[PDB]
Amino acid sequence: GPDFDVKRKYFRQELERLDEGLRKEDMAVHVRRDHVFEDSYRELHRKSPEEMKNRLYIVFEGEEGQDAGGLLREWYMIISREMFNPMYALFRTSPGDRVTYTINPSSHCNPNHLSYFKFVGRIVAKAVYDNRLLECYFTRSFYKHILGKSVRYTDMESEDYHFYQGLVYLLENDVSTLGYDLTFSTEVQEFGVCEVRDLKPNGANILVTEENKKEYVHLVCQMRMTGAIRKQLAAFLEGFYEIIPKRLISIFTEQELELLISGLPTIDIDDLKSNTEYHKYQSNSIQIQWFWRALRSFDQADRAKFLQFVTGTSKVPLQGFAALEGMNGIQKFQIHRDDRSTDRLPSAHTCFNQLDLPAYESFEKLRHMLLLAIQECSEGFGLA
Amino acid sequence: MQIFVKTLTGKTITLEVEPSDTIENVKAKIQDKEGIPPDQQRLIFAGKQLEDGRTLSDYNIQKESTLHLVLRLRG
């Protein structure tokens, strides 16, 4: 809350102290939507750190959209989702309630993975530098590495809850009671038969007993969470620290760092409603009453698609909807009435956070038209 | 002849058209099946945007072909 704002005030102020003396320019990024990760990598991974602090503007190939802010927000969102596509073998999903991601230890699947990891770290740092939001969610282990905190074996509960609660049982009980064997090595699932990595000198030939099980629990977590991904972490943090210095980002906690990158964890329609502007409609016009009724009738997944529709991103800025950013400064969510025809679907200008809403003739039609638009056009810019 | 129009979410719309039908005609047949005005529709086939004046045969759209529907709603 307020203590978070105090940190961010100091954080942003020192960030702007470091670029005093930088003639910033607008830097174009030409990408194809279906190749947004590969295209952005080709267009940005060889830029200097000073160049990365330029103002990026996005040009989607074959799309009328002109980036006045809304295209960059969508670019950050769709590139953050494609970095965790398992087809790139860069990241994997951590098993748990909420889905977070882990560095894939088999990332040498991709021969240039260390180049891509530095780029992924650059993008995350660039998103924080730009005060833009990503659809990234990491484990407590990963956040601790960025913050320079030491990883403890208790952090395994967030990385793998059931593996961790297998370790508490090993610590709590006797090895004579397990029914299986354990050695000082952990499995290399690189599509090989019983290929293992040692947790200790000649660890694969050493049995886990009650005399050494605490050492095993400590060693296996340091491996699972830092040793097995040592080179990929260094590449990521290298690209990250090139833009955001380590001394500055480490003032935050793991929860604060997550909010800094992903924004607010929920979409509050009531907060959006008290920070909405209307042009040609009034707050009590019938289509506005039907609109909020329809928006409230959406589940959390559909109200995310709606946020993407009118702003470009599914994420909410940290200061709420009263700080929704537009071109020059703050531009609250606004709804304009579309007088052209009532058979048109609703339209949006993501740079102004503006929704063009036709004067529909029934609540059923408005709800149907709104849900169709946000579901079948959550992304993509067909208008200027 | 039956063609398939695939939406962003993956929903499939099956149409009954003939190779002489214009792209404008196909957009009108989508309006009757989904309620979307044609001036908000854009059709994609083999990575190329289909102009309203051309026919399906002008784009080599044969039977059981699959088109992609994107909406022109966001700027």
Author numbering:
A (entry chain A): 3991 to 4374
B (entry chain C): 1 to 75
Source paper text:
HUWE1 regulates diverse cellular processes, including protein quality control, DNA repair, and transcription; its deregulation is linked to tumorigenesis and neurodevelopmental disorders, with disease-associated mutations accumulating in the C-terminal catalytic HECT domain. This ∼45-kDa domain consists of an N-terminal lobe (N-lobe), which recruits the ubiquitin-loaded E2, and a C-terminal lobe (C-lobe), which harbors a catalytic cysteine, interacts with the donor ubiquitin, and can encode specificity in isopeptide linkage formation between the donor and an acceptor ubiquitin. A flexible interlobe linker enables rearrangements of the HECT domain during catalysis: for ubiquitin transfer from the E2 to the E3, the lobes adopt a particular “inverted T” conformation, whereas the transfer of ubiquitin from the E3 to a substrate requires an “L”-conformation with specific interlobe contacts. Here, we employ ubiquitin-propargylamine (Ub-Prg)7,8 to reconstitute and structurally characterize the interaction between the human HECT ligase HUWE1 and active site-linked “donor” ubiquitin.
We thus interrogated the reactivity of wild-type (WT) HUWE1HECT toward Ub-Prg, which carries an alkyne functionality at the C-terminus of Gly75 and was expected to preferentially react with the active site due to ubiquitin-mediated interactions. The resulting vinyl thioether linkage closely mimics the native thioester, except for one oxygen atom, and is resistant to hydrolysis. To illuminate how the HECT domain of HUWE1 interacts with the donor ubiquitin and understand the significance of the C-tail, we determined a crystal structure of the reconstituted ubiquitin-HUWE1HECT complex. Consistent with our mutational analyses, this structure shows the ubiquitin C-terminus linked to the catalytic cysteine of HUWE1 via a vinyl thioether (as well as Supplementary Figure 3a in the Supporting Information). The globular portion of ubiquitin contacts the C-lobe through a conserved, catalytically important interface. Besides this in-cis interaction, the crystal lattice does not contain any hydrophobic protein interfaces suspected to be functionally relevant; and, although Cys4184 mediates an intermolecular disulfide bond between adjacent HECT domains in the crystal, the ubiquitin-HUWE1HECT complex is monomeric in solution. In contrast, our structure of the donor ubiquitin-HUWE1HECT complex reveals an L-conformation, as seen in distinct crystal forms of several NEDD4-type E3s in apo, ubiquitin and substrate-bound forms,12,20−22 and structures of a truncated E6AP HECT domain. Interestingly, our crystal structure closely recapitulates the specific rotational state of the C-lobe within an L-conformation that is critical for ubiquitin transfer to a substrate. An exception is a structure of an autoinhibited C-terminal construct of HUWE1, in which the C-tail is locked in an inactive state.
